[PDB]
């Protein structure tokens, strides 16, 4: 029944500097909170328990404080293998996780490398035509993906899929396809997938 | 050395019953308790519950006592859970963790890979695996593709040349078209090869592995 | 009448032999004709006798001079002077021996050598090769003396001969090749008398074929290559101009240029 | 008479001592070419003929720029299926390959093996330097300049010292890109910066593959910055200071070299 209110729900900072979580309990805890770092993919793991006890082979610069219903976790000397999702768990009575917490790190800015590939053969048998566009390794994560058939606009059919963050240049990377019919895609000739002066790379059949 | 090897991805039909496994591979399985923690793709994590093996002891979230049923195998170091009457709201993925109860300072160490579940009325489709030929791309290194479109469930494993190398690999999520899915993945090598390079796409549920 | 340089090996130094060689070079050839940065000789087919000659004066040390001929058309030695005596190599036409008869005028006696100027009579009648007769100024300074005493009977044929092949290299084909300018201008510099490396024959036995692949070049690349030597005489083979442009410096009329 | 150019089917070298290359041994309209070491057998992927219509043919195709801009990729084509003045090209005696339409050079824009071939706009770099020949190996020489003295450079400064031939810090090799690299290292080139007056040429690597790298044995006796316009230059003709400027072309005995093969 013990509400655990963990701010803020995301964060952003760079490399070499320090953020601060901060936890609320509904009531006194009695310092029976712990801290985890959850990475996509992996299982979570414990760094800290018992308010401020670190774990075994984590590295100093995490640390924890609090007492009562009040908690904080600090990590100094950021670095690009920290990006994860934190969480505070209370363990005083039964168990309560916390909202969780998304940490950015904060790069220099960086263009996308953006490639282009025209539907396969082999998917032209099949009925259908897609044409592919990448997006890899840019800052910041915010990018529009402009797709021009003939010059002209087409937003209908494009499906967009964003990765997590790089956990060592610090990185995004976006894939948008736009899946369009074989005949609907023989009808048009030139294909080109613009960034946002915006970045262009295109075929031509 | 203390692995939680949990079952693999789970796919079931609203309404039906799904088992989760959790071996234990590092310890005495019968001294710790062994947690549950659910985590959707908008909600945290929460937690489920918790068995004492070598016990009977159960703890329920409440939330979930008359979904869960946590059951141990003390012969094999392997717990389960079982989630009943499946609604699309259980479509999750689940976590078993080890909590060594032996002082209540303690909280949970250990967690499991995690196994997806979903919960969809969906049929099992293979995805038809599609290369991405690019000749006019420098950046001192060419940028191949695999396009990985139309297949049914989660998740596909896509690798190059039979896992090398991962300078290099960008393997995109799935989106889902309501319930179909689709995902790219591309890989940069340098310029002087193309010696060869092809990647391999596993999608186990449809039991399909194309070499394209 | 015809235009003269004048050389002295007395206090010769690098700047006074670099000076010569490039004074005899500007009255060569007009600098015109330049194929692939390469000047090129005029033509021997239209040239009036008035430009076919040059005069190439040597004194060394103890007032001994001699006066040489070289023909403008591939810039080798065609005769001597001395005093009131001239002698000539047997030309290898009848035309050219008309040109001969245009050469000093001041001279009391014609002689006619039964030989000619290449260097496989040169070499037999010397009783050497050019790789054992050594060059540089005190060679040159000798040989000067060995033109001026032939006419009284004073210096014996293979000295004469060998005395040719050190003003030909020296004079002429350091002319052609500002390679071999720069290996006697390496001799006359530290004071070393040498003879030529390997790399230096194979360049002076090419230099029909390097003129006729430079000027008969499709952009500059050769129809078929040439094989060289280095120091160790090792060989290597030459595919396009490009490094032949520090080596060559003049080069015989083989062909006019294309319109274009 | 007249000269009659023939048709030398010849290889054509560039940066870091890479033959000009059809990638993949493969001849089908749009195949771009790379840089590729040269091999010592006889395929007709590096085998060039020196058409007399200014076309550039391997196995029959022609080499073919992609456009008129920079910097398009370069690629084997059907000489009669492309643009007929897309596939001229004129071999220039400083080592430059040059699309009379565009005004554009062939260039390499990577040292790596297999890049792919583009033009660019001229600036005379190391990237836009080649050499027709057979020749798969550079020139090796000493170079010898003012008093007599030989090149040499020691990991980072080039000067001039003793010719002593012994000492292989004095040994050259001369790259078809138009690189003037030591024997030691041949990762590292003989580089001019900023094209300034009295700038101390240097020993750097070729990475960048820079106009400044790129010199030119002239007929005069001088090596030429062709970009800059400037000579190296033993500065004040004191071998003493151990330092090789770039400086404008005057002839004197302190820019004449020559390379004792
Ligand atoms: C190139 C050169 O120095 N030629 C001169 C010439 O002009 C002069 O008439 C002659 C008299 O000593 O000497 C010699």
């Known amino acids: 029944d013990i509400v655990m209110t963990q701010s803020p729900s995301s964060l952003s900072a760079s490399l070499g500097g320090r953020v601060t979580i901060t936890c609320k309990a509904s009531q006194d805890i009695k310092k029976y909170i712990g801290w985890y770092q959850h990475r996509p993919g992996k299982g979570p793991r414990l760094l800290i328990h018992?308010?401020?006890t670190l774990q075994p082979g984590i590295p100093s610069r995490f640390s924890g404080g609090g007492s009562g219903r009040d908690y904080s976790f600090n990590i100094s000397n950021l670095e690009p293998e920290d990006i994860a999702t934190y969480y505070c768990?209370?363990?005083?009575?039964?168990?309560?996780f916390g909202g969780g917490t998304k940490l950015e790190i904060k790069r220099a800015d960086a263009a996308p490398t953006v490639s282009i590939f025209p539907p396969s053969s082999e998917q032209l048998t099949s009925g259908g035509a897609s044409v592919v566009c990448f997006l890899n390794n840019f800052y910041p994560k915010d990018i529009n993906v402009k797709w021009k058939i003939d010059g002209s606009e087409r937003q209908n059919g494009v499906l967009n899929s964003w990765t997590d963050q790089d956990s060592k240049d610090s990185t995004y990377s976006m894939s948008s396809t736009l899946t369009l019919t074989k005949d609907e895609y023989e009808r048009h000739n030139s294909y080109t997938c613009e960034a946002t002066s915006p970045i262009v790379k295109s075929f031509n059949r | 050395q203390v692995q939680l090897q949990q079952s693999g991805a789970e796919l079931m039909k609203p309404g039906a019953s799904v088992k989760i496994s959790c071996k234990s591979t590092?310890?005495?399985?019968?001294?710790?308790?062994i947690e549950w923690i659910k985590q959707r793709p908008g909600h945290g994590l929460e937690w489920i519950g918790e068995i004492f093996p070598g016990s009977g002891s159960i703890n329920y979230n409440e939330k979930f006592k008359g979904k869960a049923t946590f059951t141990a195998d003390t012969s094999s170091n392997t717990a389960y859970m079982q989630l009943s009457s499946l609604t699309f709201e259980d479509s999750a993925v689940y976590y078993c963790?080890?909590?060594?109860?032996?002082?209540?300072?303690?909280?949970?160490?250990?967690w499991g890979q995690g196994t997806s579940v979903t919960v969809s009325s969906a049929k099992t489709t293979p995805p038809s695996v599609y290369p991405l030929a690019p000749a006019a791309q420098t950046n001192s290194m060419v940028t191949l593709g695999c396009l990985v479109k139309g297949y049914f469930p989660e998740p596909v494993t896509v690798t190059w040349n039979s896992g090398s190398l991962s300078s290099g690999v960008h393997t995109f999520p799935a989106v889902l078209q309501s319930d179909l899915y689709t995902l790219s993945s591309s890989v940069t090598v340098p310029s002087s090869p193309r010696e060869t390079v092809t990647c391999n796409v596993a999608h186990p549920a449809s039991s399909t592995k194309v070499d394209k | 009448q015809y235009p003269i340089i004048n050389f002295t090996t007395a206090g010769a130094t690098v700047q006074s032999y670099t000076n010569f060689i490039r004074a005899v070079r500007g009255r060569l050839t007009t600098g015109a004709d330049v194929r692939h940065e390469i000047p090129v000789l005029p033509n021997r087919v239209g040239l009036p006798i008035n430009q076919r000659f040059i005069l190439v004066e040597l004194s060394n040390h103890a007032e001994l001079s001699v006066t040489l001929a070289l023909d403008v058309t591939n810039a080798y030695v065609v005769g001597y002077r001395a005093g009131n005596s001239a002698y000539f190599f047997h030309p290898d036409n009848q035309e050219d021996a008309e040109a001969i008869t245009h050469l000093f005028t001041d001279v009391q006696n014609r002689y006619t050598f039964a030989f000619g100027g290449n260097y496989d009579r040169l070499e037999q009648l010397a009783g050497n090769l050019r790789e054992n007769i050594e060059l540089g100024n005190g060679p040159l300074e000798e040989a000067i003396s060995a033109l001026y005493y032939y006419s009284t009977g004073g210096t014996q044929l293979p000295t004469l001969a060998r005395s040719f092949i050190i003003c030909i290299q020296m004079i002429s084909e350091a002319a052609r090749f500002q390679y071999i300018e720069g290996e006697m201008r390496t001799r006359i510099r530290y004071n070393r008398r040498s003879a030529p490396d390997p790399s230096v024959i194979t360049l002076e036995n090419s230099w029909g074929r390097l003129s006729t692949a430079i000027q008969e070049s499709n952009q500059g690349a050769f129809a078929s290559p040439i094989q060289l030597q280095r120091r160790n005489g090792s060989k290597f083979s030459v595919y396009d101009v490009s490094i032949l442009i520090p080596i060559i410096a003049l080069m015989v009329y083989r062909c006019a240029p294309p319109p274009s | 008479d007249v000269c009659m150019d023939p048709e030398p089917i010849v290889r054509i070298v560039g940066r870091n001592g890479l033959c000009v290359d059809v990638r993949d041994g493969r001849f089908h309209n749009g195949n771009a070419i790379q840089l590729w070491p040269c091999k010592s057998n006889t395929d007709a992927n590096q085998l060039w003929t020196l058409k007399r219509d200014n076309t550039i043919r391997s196995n029959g195709k022609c080499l073919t720029t992609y456009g008129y801009s920079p910097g398009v990729y370069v690629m084997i084509y059907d000489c009669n299926t492309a643009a007929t003045d897309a596939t001229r090209w004129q071999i220039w005696d400083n080592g430059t390959i040059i699309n009379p339409r565009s005004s554009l050079v062939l260039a390499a824009t990577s040292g790596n093996s297999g890049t792919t071939l583009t033009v660019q706009t001229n600036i005379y770099a190391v990237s836009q330097g080649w050499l027709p020949t057979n020749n798969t190996q550079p020139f090796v020489t000493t170079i010898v300049g003012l008093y007599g003295l030989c090149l040499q450079a020691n990991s980072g400064q080039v000067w001039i010292e003793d010719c002593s031939s012994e000492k292989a810090e004095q040994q050259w090799a001369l790259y078809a890109d138009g690189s003037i690299r030591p024997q030691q290292n041949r990762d590292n080139c003989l580089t001019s910066d900023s094209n300034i007056r009295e700038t101390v040429v240097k020993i750097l690597s070729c990475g960048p593959a820079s106009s400044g790298q790129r010199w030119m044995f002239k007929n005069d006796g001088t090596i030429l910055n062709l970009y800059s316009g400037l000579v190296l230059d033993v500065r004040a003709s004191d071998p003493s200071l151990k330092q090789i400027i770039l400086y404008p072309l005057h002839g004197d005995p302190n820019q004449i070299w020559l390379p004792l093969f």
């Open positions: 963790a080890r909590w060594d109860g032996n002082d209540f300072h303690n909280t949970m160490d250990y």
């Open positions: 018992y308010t401020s």
């Open positions: 590092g310890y005495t399985f019968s001294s710790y308790w």
């Open positions: 768990l209370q363990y005083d009575h039964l168990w309560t």
